[PDB]
């Protein structure tokens, strides 16, 4: 039936829908008609944001209504006066309210002082005296807890209810223990080459060392925690975080190198020098994947900068400027493909990694793309002598030099300066919300350690009406304070 009306008059149909939603998003109407005004503002705000995407022409009007809904629920929370009211609001179920705000992207609600004060008490738990300690005393506490992480993780395993058993239960020490567990995994990787026997460099079927079994235990531990997080939350929620994505690729690369290593030891065990092996021998392929996965292991430490209040806001700012880099990739990718077509047409009829670079880099599509790629830096990686034809072609050598010179001006002088111009413009807009964005990211990271589902570090994990009436009393107080 609605489709029939849209055929007769679509401008009138769209205007009526926006009129209704603007009436529903009235702060006065929600307070007077809804039983749970805080939850109503959360759901409506997520509802109005989706409508902006579909209604492209009404984009501006809808995102103004969503912003109005978000600011209303934040002002309602600011009227809380003591911790008893704060705990009632943030624990209600229809920290369910606190988790619901994170799911609905309520950044203003989270950054409120009442919400921030509540988070600090839960995060530190029974160790509230940590905040009274001086800076010199704080570091000695973190280092001591981190160094003795195997003991504390073991104590919880045998005596969970003991004094040392309950240490992990507080979120702050759990974050440190998990952090120190990962730092030892990176230390094992660094020591892998140092304890490598030199006689195994010429061995084609080397067996697994004791250090290799240690890394296998960690990898299963990291993997095991990954299904648990995915199973308890879901695919879309788990895939959204960048740290989770980097764990997917590096875990598959670690399984591939060890699967290839076992097969190689059982098939190819010959004793021959390294210089005589095949290019695509399984042992050489195994080492290529291992090196690649080591880069992705060290790059996971970016999320640990969010906790710091000095490097935290800066890291979040750099994350939001990566979206502007993707748009420039699309335009530059076509320019690189255009000059590759012409350059390989001129020279193939008639590489750069040698000590004496030659014209042979332009004799293939892959070689031409690599040569043009290294011109972007402006550090003189490739010489001009490459453009000269080996036998003669005086005229064709000059034309090829002009083509390369045009590429340099277009990319190094025009495209690069344009990229800097937008980063100057975008950063100024981002700098405005630097504090609100960082606090939302830090609270999201803290909330993951509140759940007791995952408590042990990765090597150890593998081893086996009454409240609704109280909520209404607080709600009427908050509503009536807000009106006044």
């Amino acid at each position: 039936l609605c489709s029939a009306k849209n055929k007769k008059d679509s401008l009138r149909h769209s205007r009526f829908r926006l009129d209704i939603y603007r009436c529903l998003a009235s702060p006065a109407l929600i307070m007077l008609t809804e039983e749970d005004p805080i939850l109503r503002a959360f759901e409506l705000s997520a509802d109005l944001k989706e409508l902006s995407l579909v209604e492209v022409e009404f984009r501006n009007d809808y995102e103004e209504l969503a912003r109005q809904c978000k600011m209303f629920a934040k002002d309602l929370l600011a009227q809380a006066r003591n911790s008893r009211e704060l705990e009632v609001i943030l624990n209600h179920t229809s920290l369910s309210r606190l988790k619901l705000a994170i799911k609905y992207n309520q950044k203003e609600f989270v950054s409120q002082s009442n919400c921030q004060q509540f988070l600090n008490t839960v995060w530190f738990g029974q160790m509230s005296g940590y905040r009274r300690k001086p800076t010199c005393k704080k570091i000695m506490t973190v280092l001591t807890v981190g160094i003795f992480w195997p003991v504390l993780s073991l104590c919880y395993l045998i005596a969970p209810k003991s004094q040392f058993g309950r240490i992990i239960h507080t979120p702050f020490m759990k974050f440190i223990i998990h952090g120190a567990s990962y730092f030892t995994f990176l230390l094992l990787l660094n020591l892998y080459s140092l304890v490598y026997n030199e006689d195994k460099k010429n061995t084609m079927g080397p067996a697994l060392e004791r250090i290799d079994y240690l890394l296998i235990l960690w990898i299963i531990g990291m993997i095991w925690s990954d299904i648990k997080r995915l199973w308890y939350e879901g695919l879309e929620d788990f895939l959204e975080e960048s740290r989770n994505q980097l764990s997917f690729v590096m875990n598959s690369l670690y399984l591939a190198t060890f699967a290839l290593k076992v097969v190689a030891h059982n098939k190819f065990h010959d004793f021959a020098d390294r210089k005589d092996w095949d290019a695509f021998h399984p042992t050489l392929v195994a080492e290529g994947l291992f090196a690649f996965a080591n880069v992705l292991s060290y790059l996971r430490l970016f999320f640990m900068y969010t906790t710091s209040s000095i490097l935290g806001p800066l890291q979040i700012s750099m994350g939001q400027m990566l979206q502007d880099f993707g748009k420039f990739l699309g335009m530059f990718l076509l320019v690189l493909f255009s000059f590759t077509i012409g350059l390989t047409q001129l020279y193939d009829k008639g590489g750069i990694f040698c000590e004496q670079q030659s014209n042979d880099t332009f004799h293939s599509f892959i070689g031409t793309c690599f040569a043009l790629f290294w011109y972007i830096f402006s550090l003189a990686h490739v010489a001009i002598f490459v453009t000269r034809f080996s036998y003669g072609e005086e005229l064709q050598s000059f034309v090829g030099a002009v083509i390369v010179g045009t590429y340099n001006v277009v990319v190094v002088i025009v495209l690069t300066k344009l990229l800097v111009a937008m980063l100057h413009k975008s950063f100024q807009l981002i700098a405005n919300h630097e504090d609100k964005e960082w606090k939302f990211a830090r609270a999201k990271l803290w909330l993951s350690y509140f759940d007791d589902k995952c408590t042990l570090p990765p090597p150890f994990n593998i081893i086996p009406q009454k409240r609704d009436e109280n909520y209404q009393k607080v709600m009427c107080c908050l509503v009536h304070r807000y009106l006044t």
């Binding site: 990787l189 092996w277 080591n294 000095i310 100024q428």
Partner: protein, 194 residues
């Protein structure tokens, strides 16, 4: 160290025959570093001038953010250095096997650039200024897969270091200077009063 060297050694000897840890060489190096440090103290006299004072103060206030940037760059550099050293450490060659008895990248023919972690860090540091040649990723045994992986990792490191981080730093430094410029006079007058 000069007094110790005077007391200990009492004879003339060709300089090329001296060992690596001779006291005279250490004393000379420390003296040169002292000269560098001494000559840089003249910047503190700029606050007495009304033209070069506020600029010096503003440049001083802009050094806090660069360190925060350098921490993140250090993380990236450590990651890529670990990866490259893990890939390339099997093909380490001795100094005798190389021309002119070179090892490292301080030679006309750069070699063994990714054989150790310290040398890998030095090699990745010098790529920012374009002083590392592209043939250092080649392998004598001529294995195509290893060279391809090494070249890809080197290119990715170069892209991340020189195309993203430098422009981000440029934009950040632009924004910070504009805010600092507003209060230059009061800070310069406070410094000159001190």
């Amino acid at each position: 160290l000069k007094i110790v060297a005077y007391v200990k050694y009492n004879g003339s000897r060709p300089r090329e025959e001296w060992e690596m840890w001779h006291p005279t060489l250490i004393a000379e190096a420390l003296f040169a570093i002292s000269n560098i440090l001494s000559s840089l103290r003249l910047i503190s006299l700029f606050t007495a001038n009304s033209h070069l004072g506020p600029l010096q103060i503003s440049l001083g206030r802009m050094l806090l953010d660069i360190l925060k940037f350098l921490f993140i760059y250090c993380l990236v550099l450590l990651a890529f250095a670990n990866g490259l050293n893990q890939l390339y450490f099997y093909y380490e060659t001795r100094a005798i096997d190389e021309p002119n008895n070179c090892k490292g990248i301080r030679c006309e023919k750069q070699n063994n650039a990714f054989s150790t972690l310290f040398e890998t860090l030095q090699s990745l540091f010098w790529s920012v200024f374009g002083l590392l040649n592209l043939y250092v990723t080649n392998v004598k045994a001529r294995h195509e897969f290893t060279e391809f992986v090494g070249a890809t990792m080197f290119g990715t490191y170069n892209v991340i270091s020189l195309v993203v981080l430098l422009n981000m730093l440029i934009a950040m430094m632009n924004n910070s200077y504009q805010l600092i410029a507003d209060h230059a006079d009061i800070e310069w007058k406070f410094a000159r009063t001190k």
